[PDB]
Design a protein around this motif. Structure first.
Motif, PDB file in Angstrom:
ATOM      1  N   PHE A  78       0.797  -1.221   0.000  1.00  0.00           N
ATOM      2  CA  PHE A  78       0.000   0.000   0.000  1.00  0.00           C
ATOM      3  C   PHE A  78       0.830   1.271   0.000  1.00  0.00           C
ATOM      4  O   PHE A  78       0.698   2.105  -0.885  1.00  0.00           O
ATOM      5  N   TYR A 105      -0.083  -3.697   4.102  1.00  0.00           N
ATOM      6  CA  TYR A 105      -1.070  -2.614   4.185  1.00  0.00           C
ATOM      7  C   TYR A 105      -1.127  -1.978   5.553  1.00  0.00           C
ATOM      8  O   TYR A 105      -2.165  -1.421   5.955  1.00  0.00           O
ATOM      9  N   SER A 106      -0.015  -2.046   6.269  1.00  0.00           N
ATOM     10  CA  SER A 106       0.034  -1.495   7.608  1.00  0.00           C
ATOM     11  C   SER A 106       1.458  -1.367   8.129  1.00  0.00           C
ATOM     12  O   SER A 106       2.351  -2.157   7.780  1.00  0.00           O
TER      13      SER A 106
ATOM     14  N   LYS B   6     -10.018   7.258   9.833  1.00  0.00           N
ATOM     15  CA  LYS B   6     -10.481   6.952  11.178  1.00  0.00           C
ATOM     16  C   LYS B   6      -9.311   7.076  12.170  1.00  0.00           C
ATOM     17  O   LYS B   6      -8.424   6.229  12.187  1.00  0.00           O
ATOM     18  N   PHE B  86       0.449   7.100  -0.452  1.00  0.00           N
ATOM     19  CA  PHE B  86       0.044   5.924  -1.224  1.00  0.00           C
ATOM     20  C   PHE B  86      -0.471   6.283  -2.625  1.00  0.00           C
ATOM     21  O   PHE B  86      -0.977   7.375  -2.859  1.00  0.00           O
ATOM     22  N   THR B  87      -0.338   5.342  -3.550  1.00  0.00           N
ATOM     23  CA  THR B  87      -0.889   5.508  -4.885  1.00  0.00           C
ATOM     24  C   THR B  87      -2.331   5.093  -4.792  1.00  0.00           C
ATOM     25  O   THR B  87      -2.623   4.037  -4.247  1.00  0.00           O
ATOM     26  N   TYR B  96     -10.925   3.848  -0.053  1.00  0.00           N
ATOM     27  CA  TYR B  96      -9.805   3.730   0.873  1.00  0.00           C
ATOM     28  C   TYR B  96     -10.172   4.212   2.267  1.00  0.00           C
ATOM     29  O   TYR B  96     -10.626   5.345   2.422  1.00  0.00           O
ATOM     30  N   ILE B  98      -8.282   4.889   5.868  1.00  0.00           N
ATOM     31  CA  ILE B  98      -7.013   4.964   6.571  1.00  0.00           C
ATOM     32  C   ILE B  98      -7.258   4.981   8.096  1.00  0.00           C
ATOM     33  O   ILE B  98      -7.754   5.971   8.625  1.00  0.00           O
ATOM     34  N   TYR B  99      -6.946   3.889   8.780  1.00  0.00           N
ATOM     35  CA  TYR B  99      -7.072   3.842  10.229  1.00  0.00           C
ATOM     36  C   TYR B  99      -5.757   4.365  10.829  1.00  0.00           C
ATOM     37  O   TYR B  99      -4.669   4.081  10.311  1.00  0.00           O
ATOM     38  N   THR B 110      -3.274   1.628   9.356  1.00  0.00           N
ATOM     39  CA  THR B 110      -3.703   0.477   8.542  1.00  0.00           C
ATOM     40  C   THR B 110      -4.656   0.934   7.419  1.00  0.00           C
ATOM     41  O   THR B 110      -5.623   1.646   7.675  1.00  0.00           O
ATOM     42  N   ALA B 111      -4.387   0.533   6.191  1.00  0.00           N
ATOM     43  CA  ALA B 111      -5.252   0.894   5.062  1.00  0.00           C
ATOM     44  C   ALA B 111      -6.232  -0.220   4.730  1.00  0.00           C
ATOM     45  O   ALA B 111      -5.847  -1.361   4.602  1.00  0.00           O
ATOM     46  N   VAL B 112      -7.504   0.114   4.623  1.00  0.00           N
ATOM     47  CA  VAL B 112      -8.503  -0.862   4.148  1.00  0.00           C
ATOM     48  C   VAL B 112      -8.968  -0.399   2.762  1.00  0.00           C
ATOM     49  O   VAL B 112      -9.434   0.731   2.595  1.00  0.00           O
ATOM     50  N   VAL B 113      -8.817  -1.270   1.773  1.00  0.00           N
ATOM     51  CA  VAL B 113      -9.114  -0.926   0.384  1.00  0.00           C
ATOM     52  C   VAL B 113     -10.212  -1.846  -0.116  1.00  0.00           C
ATOM     53  O   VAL B 113     -10.047  -3.063  -0.119  1.00  0.00           O
ATOM     54  N   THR B 114     -11.346  -1.264  -0.502  1.00  0.00           N
ATOM     55  CA  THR B 114     -12.478  -2.046  -1.003  1.00  0.00           C
ATOM     56  C   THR B 114     -13.065  -1.482  -2.308  1.00  0.00           C
ATOM     57  O   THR B 114     -12.701  -0.399  -2.764  1.00  0.00           O
TER      58      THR B 114
ATOM     59  N   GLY C  13      -5.077  -5.864   3.057  1.00  0.00           N
ATOM     60  CA  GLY C  13      -5.670  -4.536   3.034  1.00  0.00           C
ATOM     61  C   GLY C  13      -7.197  -4.587   3.019  1.00  0.00           C
ATOM     62  O   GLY C  13      -7.882  -3.828   2.315  1.00  0.00           O
TER      63      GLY C  13
END
Lengths: 116, 116, 115, 115
Positions: A78, A105-106, B6, B86-87, B96, B98-99, B110-114, C13
């Motif tokens: 990421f 990703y972290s 977050k 990040f890209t 995206y 971003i926690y 931590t990145a959550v990508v959905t 991720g």
């Protein structure tokens, strides 16, 4: 070494080896002047980065090349990199250890500051 | 919002409220162009940051003003700020999150990508 | 609405999907009795483990089966599971959100507590 | 030399000093029997909990009394403790370093495993 770095790999459960690390010091004109660089050892550390002679008061940026690292393992991550920016030695010389735990990703970073 | 943040406070056990957040997009000349900014809500989030119209492919930098935050609570912290670079949207538009978990001498991101 | 668990996959991720979560409460005899159970959603969270009326003051243990989660992807992780043990509603009711960020050899757990 | 525990204080930026650490091993009867104990040093670590010969294959539970640590500073933290449960030396001997970064409402645990 008054400036230490401990980089861990949370995927494999080992130290992150051969991780490029570039350190910069904020110049009088607010630009980032290269200060020191290296690659993490087998233990995930930087050996011979600086000394009490060069490590003076100032604002430092520690840039960890987490992208190259993951990519070298065949993983596309990421972050473009992981950065740690902090004022050092603003109250008398100190010993700083920067812990960095890496996942694709972290990443976490924890600073330990003690008296040399 | 395709770009969410977050921010949590690990000292108090709550969302980090009123945390300044500045977002930048890498310009054609490798400089950081302001893209969006805001302050975290009571829930620790950024409301109305961008939309699928502006959030195009590119490299983004999300800067969290963790220093002001801790200092406002009467705490003097380690980091000058917390940065996430990040890209985004390099493979089709994405959502995206971003926690960022904050402590005075530590932060995790931590990145959550959905798929939107 | 009072107990929420959010599980993230720090490697891929994404939300950790279909992850087993078991909750226990400490019994008078100092044993752990089952209290609630679920599997995280496509969004890596459980929100209906309990309710405002049922979630009484006590010592709770939230246990996440991270071992099975990693093993499926063919990974041999460190932890047998991730567990959070905490006293709930000690000083009156609160809403609790427990965030769990997971990697094969690392997990963090953060709680946001309100009310 | 095979089991090391390193405890950091994410709030003060230092090693967590004089922190109680208890180790247990899972017994044939599925109960947890005491195996080792210590208090972290001025450098927030224990290294002599066990030895290469004593640390046999099994399921170990490392428990850190984070509650007492925070309570002294007048803080009412979330967790009752931080604990790590893992199978050691399953596939042959290994050296294990467990890093624990602590905050009142958050703790991470990372293991470095070698050999």
């Amino acid at each position: 070494c008054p400036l230490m770095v401990k980089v861990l790999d949370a995927v494999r459960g080992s130290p992150a080896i051969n991780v490029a690390v570039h350190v910069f010091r904020k110049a009088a004109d607010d630009t980032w002047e290269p200060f020191a660089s290296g690659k993490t050892s087998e233990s995930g550390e930087l050996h011979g980065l600086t000394t009490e002679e060069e490590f003076v008061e100032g604002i430092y940026k520690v840039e960890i090349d987490t992208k190259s690292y993951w990519k070298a393992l065949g993983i596309s991550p990421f972050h473009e990199h992981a950065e740690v920016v902090f004022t050092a030695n603003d109250s008398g010389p100190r010993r700083y250890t920067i812990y960095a735990e890496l996942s694709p990703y972290s990443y976490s970073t924890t600073a330990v500051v003690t008296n040399p």
